[PDB]
Amino acid sequence: GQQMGRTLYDDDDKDRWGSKIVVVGANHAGTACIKTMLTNYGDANEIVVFDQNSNISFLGSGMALWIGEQIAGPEGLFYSDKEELESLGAKVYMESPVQSIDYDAKTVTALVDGKNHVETYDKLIFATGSQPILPPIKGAEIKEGSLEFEATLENLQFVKLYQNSADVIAKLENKDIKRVAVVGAGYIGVELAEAFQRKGKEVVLIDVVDTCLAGYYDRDLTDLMAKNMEEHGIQLAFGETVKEVAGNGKVEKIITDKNEYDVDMVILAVGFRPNTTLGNGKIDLFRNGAFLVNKRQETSIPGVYAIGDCATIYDNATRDTNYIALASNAVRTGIVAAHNACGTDLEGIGVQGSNGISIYGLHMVSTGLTLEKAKRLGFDAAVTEYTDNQKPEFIEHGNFPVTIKIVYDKDSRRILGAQMAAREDVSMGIHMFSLAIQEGVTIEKLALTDIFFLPHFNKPYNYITMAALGAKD
Amino acid sequence: GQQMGRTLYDDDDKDRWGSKIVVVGANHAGTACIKTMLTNYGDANEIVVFDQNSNISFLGSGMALWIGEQIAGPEGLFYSDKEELESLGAKVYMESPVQSIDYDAKTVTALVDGKNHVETYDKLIFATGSQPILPPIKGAEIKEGSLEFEATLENLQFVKLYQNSADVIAKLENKDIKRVAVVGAGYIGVELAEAFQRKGKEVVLIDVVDTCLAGYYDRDLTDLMAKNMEEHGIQLAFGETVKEVAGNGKVEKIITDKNEYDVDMVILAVGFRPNTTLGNGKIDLFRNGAFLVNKRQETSIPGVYAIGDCATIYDNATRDTNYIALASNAVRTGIVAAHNACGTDLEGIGVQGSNGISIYGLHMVSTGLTLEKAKRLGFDAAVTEYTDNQKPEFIEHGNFPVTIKIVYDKDSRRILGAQMAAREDVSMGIHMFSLAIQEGVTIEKLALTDIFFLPHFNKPYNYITMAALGAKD
Ligand SMILES: Cc1cc2nc3c(=O)[nH]c(=O)nc-3n(C[C@H](O)[C@H](O)[C@H](O)COP(=O)(O)OP(=O)(O)OC[C@H]3O[C@@H](n4cnc5c(N)ncnc54)[C@H](O)[C@@H]3O)c2cc1C
Ligand SMILES: Cc1cc2nc3c(=O)[nH]c(=O)nc-3n(C[C@H](O)[C@H](O)[C@H](O)COP(=O)(O)OP(=O)(O)OC[C@H]3O[C@@H](n4cnc5c(N)ncnc54)[C@H](O)[C@@H]3O)c2cc1C
């Protein structure tokens, strides 16, 4: 598991009011925030929690691992629970949806055991996350009133909760499910494509765009990832807009503008949107509905905070407010918010959208902006790349080539992003680029950065130094 | 190999000066400097090189690899040579030791083919490196006039040149060599101890200090490494000062202030000191004798630079001038001196003493100051550490524990160093810390740094984040 004690920000409460803090949502962001408040300021504040689901902390990435038989079962895909939060001092109401907030009276109303439950608060923290987007596809609809995204058509699956994952695992126990279509080639769909193929199904990955992982890796790497999937039995249907999902009583065929595929199941991995309705317009929202928050995760309403996927985050690569739905950001915004609502002044430092993906032996990582996105967003970006073996050629075993791409602002010279891909795990190296971007390090300064040398680990003239020195523009 | 075109610093000679540039020494630092000058400013300058040895670019780290038989031979241990430098445009005199310098007439006097050769210069760049340290030990003497560190006593070996390595190898063909004594428990001595053990020799590792690797790791990790060596039969004799190496015509035993050992071969790996004799007292020196240089690698004599093992370097961990004999520094200082010497203003950024070591499957990396070293320097330091598995417990294979230590200043909160140990390669990780120290990142800021999450690579609450968040002091 993963549980600690007091963080290093924990400030001595001099003369601050003892606040009653209500948290809406106790998943990845909520749990992080709650535990931080309890393990750091304990009894000084009354923590009350509401979550409409029946479970919390389910690791989304566990869905593909489970389906792809990379792990025996669901055990371990949860790292905390109600009992764990109560043992730290929180009062937890599960399966209790908060349905309205009164910012003037400072109360929230939730549905506890079918009955309006009113709870007062001094500080309010929204950790309501997001929910999957239903695309305009004929035949794709959710059963009215469903709270677990259940499609009306049998075998049309959504991605979001543990229930959704178990649903698929169970259905897959049906020998009639031989062909699966995965809609959306972002990292979620890519992993699910591999997962289904690994389970032994026929998979067709469909996306309106011409390649996979378009928002995080440049064409060289996405092409590589696509080739990787193809060489494993996954059929690629890029550049196709899904029109309809048909069948008689269950999924039987998916129709795009360029083809028709016979399939026994369709998975929608098209993205999510923030759950901010409780705001009731009283709170400033980002263009996508996310609660707009400053670096202390505070909303436009004092004493009201938003964290995780229901709120924005500061992107150091673009140097603007942004929206990055990642468990990593959920944990940090939760930690930042916890300290502030408890009276400790703590400014967040922004994020770079660092991410990693591992598909059939191909390991990739990236952080910041790809060259294409940097340009599309108006930066005079350039990229410097290099492909070389990780270790000196004289090393007899465990060597392998690594490709690195360092994107930088030709103008200001600051690093805007980096990408790495290799057949072995070099993911630890992306951390340096995350920090580099956060700190505003230039491609020039980076080139001279002290990168150690040991033949067992790298080359004297390693690919990082070489890529940086090779910068042109 | 490891060659390239122009660096990103290559500045267009608006209206600069071309110079006659003489380089003394063409090994790691020299070759890096020479190639940078010739590759970026080609014909604008005239480059003459002098090196007293008969070969250059030999990677010292391969010595242990060679003896311990982890690699085929020494072939890939060279990455450049006389012909490559000359074909780049430099005049190269191999086996030509510069015996004196006239700073007034701006001439160097070398011994070329038994006769003196006077070369005039506009700019002088010292890359004379270092030579092995030889404390006063009875029976330990280098042959008079030997420029190859050949001991007068048969089987008393030094660790410096390719020839030294080739020598030991040849001597190991002598069935009589059964037990080896390694003097010096730094990384070189530890690596050689493993190498001789692998060759099936009986090894006794001797050091004045109570532990191995005292300069780069804290007692925890060094104790771990000690046990690692003992686990393979290496006898440790720490806390002992070698007083004499005895033998009737050849090494028969070595004696310390606490004991005596019967050995057949003795290797001295006590350390290195700068070769700055040519300074002739006209150039300011550092406490240890190294040419004292600034951020541009220039000595106290305008037009005269010094790089690599013969000069100092700026340490961002201590935030002061320091001496750190590493190839990584040789390379970077050489690149900076090249640009500056050729008219391109380029200020160096300093180094952190980043380093790595791999012995019997135990991989460790460190950068900056250890807690003990920080304190030995007067820093009010503290360390925050953590040990946990690399990935979630639910991961089937490839998981392993990692121990991380982060040393910081209790007052400024500035990060001073970091160490990592695991039985799987997490070396890429030390780079982020090396950059952190360079950029003066605080432990609080580091705790909030964007570290991605992907079950295949790490845990949501990874050990770096956890360690940082746990800064108690
Ligand atoms: C298949 C998949 C794979 C992923 N893989 C990775 C990965 O490998 N690495 C990574 O960093 N990220 C990954 N993510 C993203 C990560 O899971 C999300 O960023 C994270 O779950 C967001 O956490 P959150 O707490 O902000 O929101 P959510 O997970 O959306 O949780 C919000 C919580 O609040 C509750 N709630 C909402 N409204 C109310 C209400 N009105 N009243 C009471 N309770 C309410 C909900 O029940 C829920 O428990 C993945 C996501 C998916 C779907
Ligand atoms: C066994 C061993 C293992 C090592 N492992 C690592 C490691 O894994 N990682 C790492 O980063 N570093 C390592 N190092 C350190 C690294 O080798 C040195 O930091 C580096 O060699 C210094 O390069 P240099 O060019 O400054 O000096 P040197 O290598 O000392 O070379 C100086 C050159 O100048 C010439 N010269 C000297 N005086 C004169 C003169 N008067 N006239 C003409 N020519 C002259 C010499 O012949 C020589 O070629 C190791 C060293 C050893 C011995």
Short mmCIF file of C-alpha atoms in Angstrom, two decimals, chain A residues 110-346:
data_model
loop_
_atom_site.label_atom_id
_atom_site.label_comp_id
_atom_site.label_asym_id
_atom_site.label_seq_id
_atom_site.Cartn_x
_atom_site.Cartn_y
_atom_site.Cartn_z
CA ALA A 110 -26.56 14.99 0.44
CA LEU A 111 -28.67 11.91 0.02
CA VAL A 112 -27.87 9.69 3.01
CA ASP A 113 -29.90 6.47 3.33
CA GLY A 114 -32.49 8.03 1.06
CA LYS A 115 -33.08 11.24 3.01
CA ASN A 116 -31.91 14.83 2.69
CA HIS A 117 -28.88 15.19 4.94
CA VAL A 118 -27.74 18.72 5.75
CA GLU A 119 -24.11 19.31 6.73
CA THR A 120 -22.64 22.71 7.61
CA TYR A 121 -19.06 23.68 6.75
CA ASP A 122 -16.40 26.37 7.17
CA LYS A 123 -14.24 25.06 4.32
CA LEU A 124 -15.56 23.15 1.31
CA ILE A 125 -13.34 21.00 -0.92
CA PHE A 126 -14.66 19.66 -4.24
CA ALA A 127 -12.96 16.40 -5.26
CA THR A 128 -15.82 15.42 -7.58
CA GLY A 129 -13.60 14.42 -10.50
CA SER A 130 -15.06 13.77 -13.93
CA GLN A 131 -17.25 11.41 -15.95
CA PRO A 132 -16.99 9.84 -19.45
CA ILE A 133 -18.24 11.73 -22.48
CA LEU A 134 -20.89 10.05 -24.60
CA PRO A 135 -20.13 10.79 -28.30
CA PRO A 136 -22.89 11.39 -30.86
CA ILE A 137 -23.00 7.80 -32.11
CA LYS A 138 -26.21 6.11 -33.22
CA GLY A 139 -27.01 3.21 -30.91
CA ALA A 140 -24.86 4.53 -28.09
CA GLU A 141 -26.96 5.58 -25.13
CA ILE A 142 -26.95 5.30 -21.37
CA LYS A 143 -29.91 3.84 -19.47
CA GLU A 144 -31.85 6.76 -17.99
CA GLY A 145 -31.08 7.23 -14.31
CA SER A 146 -28.06 4.91 -14.41
CA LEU A 147 -25.30 6.15 -12.15
CA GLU A 148 -22.68 3.67 -13.33
CA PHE A 149 -22.78 4.50 -17.04
CA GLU A 150 -24.65 1.47 -18.29
CA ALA A 151 -25.29 1.44 -22.04
CA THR A 152 -28.74 0.48 -23.25
CA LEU A 153 -27.16 -1.85 -25.83
CA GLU A 154 -25.78 -5.12 -24.51
CA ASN A 155 -21.96 -5.24 -24.70
CA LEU A 156 -21.48 -1.53 -25.37
CA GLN A 157 -19.04 -0.61 -22.59
CA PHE A 158 -17.91 2.61 -20.90
CA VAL A 159 -14.67 3.27 -19.00
CA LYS A 160 -14.58 4.91 -15.57
CA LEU A 161 -15.47 2.95 -12.44
CA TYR A 162 -14.38 -0.34 -10.89
CA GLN A 163 -17.88 -1.59 -11.67
CA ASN A 164 -17.35 -0.81 -15.35
CA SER A 165 -14.12 -2.83 -15.28
CA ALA A 166 -15.66 -5.82 -13.47
CA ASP A 167 -18.62 -5.61 -15.89
CA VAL A 168 -16.25 -6.16 -18.82
CA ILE A 169 -14.27 -8.89 -17.09
CA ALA A 170 -17.51 -10.76 -16.45
CA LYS A 171 -18.91 -10.28 -19.94
CA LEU A 172 -15.57 -11.41 -21.37
CA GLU A 173 -16.34 -14.71 -19.63
CA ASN A 174 -18.71 -15.10 -22.58
CA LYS A 175 -17.14 -17.22 -25.35
CA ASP A 176 -19.35 -15.34 -27.82
CA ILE A 177 -17.20 -12.25 -27.31
CA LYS A 178 -14.54 -12.85 -29.97
CA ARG A 179 -14.17 -9.41 -31.58
CA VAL A 180 -13.75 -6.15 -29.72
CA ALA A 181 -13.72 -2.65 -31.12
CA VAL A 182 -11.98 0.04 -29.06
CA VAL A 183 -13.10 3.60 -29.81
CA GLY A 184 -10.50 6.25 -29.04
CA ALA A 185 -6.76 5.79 -29.52
CA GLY A 186 -5.56 7.92 -26.63
CA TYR A 187 -3.52 6.17 -23.96
CA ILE A 188 -6.63 4.58 -22.45
CA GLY A 189 -7.77 2.97 -25.70
CA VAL A 190 -4.24 1.86 -26.62
CA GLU A 191 -3.81 0.02 -23.33
CA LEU A 192 -7.30 -1.50 -23.66
CA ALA A 193 -6.48 -2.61 -27.21
CA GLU A 194 -3.43 -4.45 -25.93
CA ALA A 195 -5.46 -5.78 -23.00
CA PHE A 196 -8.14 -7.33 -25.23
CA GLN A 197 -5.58 -8.71 -27.66
CA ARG A 198 -3.70 -10.23 -24.74
CA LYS A 199 -6.95 -11.80 -23.54
CA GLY A 200 -7.05 -13.40 -27.00
CA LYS A 201 -9.76 -11.34 -28.71
CA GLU A 202 -9.68 -9.79 -32.18
CA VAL A 203 -9.26 -6.05 -31.76
CA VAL A 204 -9.88 -3.12 -34.04
CA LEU A 205 -8.74 0.27 -32.68
CA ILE A 206 -10.70 3.19 -34.15
CA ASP A 207 -9.95 6.92 -33.96
CA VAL A 208 -10.95 9.97 -36.02
CA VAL A 209 -7.29 11.10 -36.02
CA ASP A 210 -4.53 9.56 -38.18
CA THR A 211 -2.56 8.07 -35.28
CA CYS A 212 -2.62 7.08 -31.60
CA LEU A 213 -1.44 9.08 -28.54
CA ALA A 214 -1.55 12.24 -30.67
CA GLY A 215 -1.70 14.57 -27.69
CA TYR A 216 1.47 13.33 -26.04
CA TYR A 217 4.01 12.03 -28.54
CA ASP A 218 5.22 13.25 -31.91
CA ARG A 219 4.62 11.24 -35.09
CA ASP A 220 7.89 9.30 -34.93
CA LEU A 221 6.89 7.67 -31.64
CA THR A 222 3.16 7.30 -32.30
CA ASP A 223 4.02 5.59 -35.61
CA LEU A 224 6.28 3.27 -33.62
CA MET A 225 3.54 2.58 -31.09
CA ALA A 226 1.04 1.99 -33.90
CA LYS A 227 3.42 -0.43 -35.63
CA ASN A 228 3.89 -2.12 -32.28
CA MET A 229 0.14 -2.67 -31.90
CA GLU A 230 -0.23 -3.82 -35.48
CA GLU A 231 2.55 -6.37 -35.17
CA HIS A 232 0.59 -7.91 -32.32
CA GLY A 233 -2.69 -8.57 -34.07
CA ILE A 234 -4.45 -5.28 -33.35
CA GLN A 235 -6.17 -3.86 -36.43
CA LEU A 236 -5.79 -0.12 -36.90
CA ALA A 237 -8.72 1.95 -38.09
CA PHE A 238 -7.35 5.48 -37.75
CA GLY A 239 -8.90 8.37 -39.63
CA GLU A 240 -12.43 7.02 -39.15
CA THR A 241 -15.45 8.65 -37.50
CA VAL A 242 -17.75 6.13 -35.85
CA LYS A 243 -21.32 6.63 -37.05
CA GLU A 244 -23.23 3.89 -35.30
CA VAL A 245 -23.16 0.81 -33.07
CA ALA A 246 -25.80 -1.74 -34.15
CA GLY A 247 -27.12 -5.19 -33.35
CA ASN A 248 -30.23 -7.13 -32.39
CA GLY A 249 -30.40 -7.02 -28.62
CA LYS A 250 -26.63 -6.63 -28.28
CA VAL A 251 -23.59 -5.20 -30.03
CA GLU A 252 -23.04 -6.85 -33.41
CA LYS A 253 -21.51 -4.25 -35.68
CA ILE A 254 -19.82 -0.84 -35.52
CA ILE A 255 -20.12 1.49 -38.49
CA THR A 256 -17.67 4.25 -39.43
CA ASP A 257 -17.60 6.59 -42.42
CA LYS A 258 -15.07 4.32 -44.15
CA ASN A 259 -16.05 0.86 -43.01
CA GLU A 260 -18.22 -1.56 -41.09
CA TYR A 261 -16.82 -4.00 -38.56
CA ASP A 262 -18.40 -7.11 -37.13
CA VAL A 263 -17.78 -7.01 -33.38
CA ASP A 264 -19.22 -8.52 -30.19
CA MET A 265 -18.27 -5.64 -27.91
CA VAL A 266 -17.41 -1.96 -28.18
CA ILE A 267 -15.49 0.06 -25.60
CA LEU A 268 -15.74 3.85 -25.51
CA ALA A 269 -12.44 5.48 -24.52
CA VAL A 270 -13.22 8.98 -25.81
CA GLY A 271 -12.47 11.06 -22.73
CA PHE A 272 -14.15 12.71 -19.77
CA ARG A 273 -15.56 16.00 -18.51
CA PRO A 274 -15.34 17.59 -15.01
CA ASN A 275 -18.25 17.23 -12.54
CA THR A 276 -18.85 20.81 -11.47
CA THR A 277 -22.64 21.16 -11.47
CA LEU A 278 -22.66 21.57 -7.68
CA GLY A 279 -21.01 24.91 -8.36
CA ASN A 280 -24.42 26.21 -9.42
CA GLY A 281 -22.72 28.96 -11.43
CA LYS A 282 -21.56 30.53 -8.17
CA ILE A 283 -18.02 29.39 -9.03
CA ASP A 284 -15.81 30.58 -11.90
CA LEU A 285 -15.32 27.74 -14.39
CA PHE A 286 -12.68 26.95 -16.99
CA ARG A 287 -13.74 26.72 -20.63
CA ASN A 288 -14.39 22.98 -20.16
CA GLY A 289 -16.48 23.31 -17.01
CA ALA A 290 -13.60 22.68 -14.62
CA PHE A 291 -13.59 24.77 -11.43
CA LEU A 292 -11.06 27.51 -12.04
CA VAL A 293 -8.52 27.52 -9.19
CA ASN A 294 -5.35 29.40 -8.27
CA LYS A 295 -2.08 27.78 -7.17
CA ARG A 296 -3.53 27.11 -3.71
CA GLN A 297 -6.40 25.23 -5.38
CA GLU A 298 -8.85 27.82 -4.10
CA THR A 299 -11.90 28.65 -6.25
CA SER A 300 -13.43 32.08 -6.88
CA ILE A 301 -15.27 31.56 -3.59
CA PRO A 302 -13.19 31.94 -0.38
CA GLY A 303 -13.05 28.79 1.75
CA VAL A 304 -14.13 26.71 -1.25
CA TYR A 305 -11.45 24.56 -2.90
CA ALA A 306 -11.39 22.30 -5.96
CA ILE A 307 -8.88 19.54 -6.69
CA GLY A 308 -8.32 16.64 -9.05
CA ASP A 309 -10.17 16.18 -12.32
CA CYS A 310 -12.96 18.57 -11.35
CA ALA A 311 -10.52 21.49 -11.34
CA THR A 312 -7.83 23.17 -13.44
CA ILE A 313 -4.08 23.02 -12.84
CA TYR A 314 -1.17 25.28 -13.76
CA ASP A 315 0.86 24.03 -16.71
CA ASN A 316 4.49 25.18 -16.60
CA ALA A 317 5.11 24.10 -20.21
CA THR A 318 2.46 26.40 -21.65
CA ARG A 319 2.69 28.76 -18.67
CA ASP A 320 -1.07 29.03 -18.41
CA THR A 321 -4.01 27.57 -16.53
CA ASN A 322 -4.83 24.22 -18.07
CA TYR A 323 -6.65 20.92 -17.59
CA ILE A 324 -4.68 17.68 -17.15
CA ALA A 325 -6.70 14.70 -15.85
CA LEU A 326 -4.07 12.49 -14.25
CA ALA A 327 -3.91 10.61 -10.97
CA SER A 328 -0.55 12.29 -10.34
CA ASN A 329 -2.15 15.76 -10.41
CA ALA A 330 -5.04 14.49 -8.29
CA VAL A 331 -2.61 13.57 -5.49
CA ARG A 332 -0.67 16.84 -5.54
CA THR A 333 -3.59 19.26 -5.84
CA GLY A 334 -5.14 17.31 -2.96
CA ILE A 335 -2.06 17.79 -0.83
CA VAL A 336 -1.86 21.51 -1.64
CA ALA A 337 -5.54 22.10 -0.88
CA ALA A 338 -5.38 20.17 2.40
CA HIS A 339 -2.69 22.47 3.83
CA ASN A 340 -4.39 25.67 2.74
CA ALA A 341 -7.86 24.81 4.02
CA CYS A 342 -6.16 23.87 7.29
CA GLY A 343 -4.50 27.25 7.59
CA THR A 344 -1.06 26.55 6.13
CA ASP A 345 -0.15 28.89 3.31
CA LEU A 346 1.14 26.61 0.54
#
